[PDB]
Structure 1
């Protein structure tokens, strides 16, 4: 039941993890529409580095395409494809 130190340490260290990301934060110019779902699951760098001076960031990226409902509030809605950036590799870098 107690999680051992090296297990915690390896599981929390800087790496790509599935992250629920707000579409409007990825597409801030999309101001006249809302989306369903409003967030999407994306592999993104997360976790911590050995030193608080370091930052967990991507070194390899790729795209994925998802069907998202685009909604013009009270006017109409259409299911279309949208592309999102994912992170394939991360490392800890000075900030």
Structure 2
């Protein structure tokens, strides 16, 4: 059994490795298929346990990954793509 305290601490608003579809982060380019189709990024996750608060990023940075870009039939190539990640997260009020 996991103690309530550790449950709370572990699920409290923080940066957590999250698997994000590339088409979300780049919905303008439908020409290419991406591979892999999803990447692992640190993003804000968790609960604040207050109805009027919400978990939000307060420090950001860019990370760069090699992704295969696939033109359906013509060909493919591995280039660099940059993605947003979250370095620090905070419970802040909604409005």
TM-score range, shorter chain: over 0.9
| Aligned residues between the structures | 94
Q: CA deviation at 1:43?
A: 0.4
Give the root-mean-square deviation of aligned CA atoms.
0.9
Which stretches of structure 1, 4 residues or longer, exceed 3 Å deviation after superposition? none
The separation in 2 between residues aligned to 1:29 and 1:54, in whole angstroms, is 32
The separation in 2 between residues aligned to 1:52 and 1:35, in whole angstroms, is 38
Larger displacement relative to structure 2 (78-87 or 51-60): 51-60
TM-score, normalised with respect to structure 2: 0.94
TM-score, normalised with respect to structure 1: 0.94
The separation in 2 between residues aligned to 1:55 and 1:49, in whole angstroms, is 6
The separation in 2 between residues aligned to 1:73 and 1:59, in whole angstroms, is 39
Give the SS at the match of 1:10: helix
Which sections of structure 2, spanning at least 5 residues, go unmatched?
none
Report Cα offsets for 1:10-39 as digits up to 9, x if no partner: 000000000000101001111111100000
Q: Counterpart in 2 of 1:73?
A: 72
Which sections of structure 1, spanning at least 5 residues, go unmatched?
none
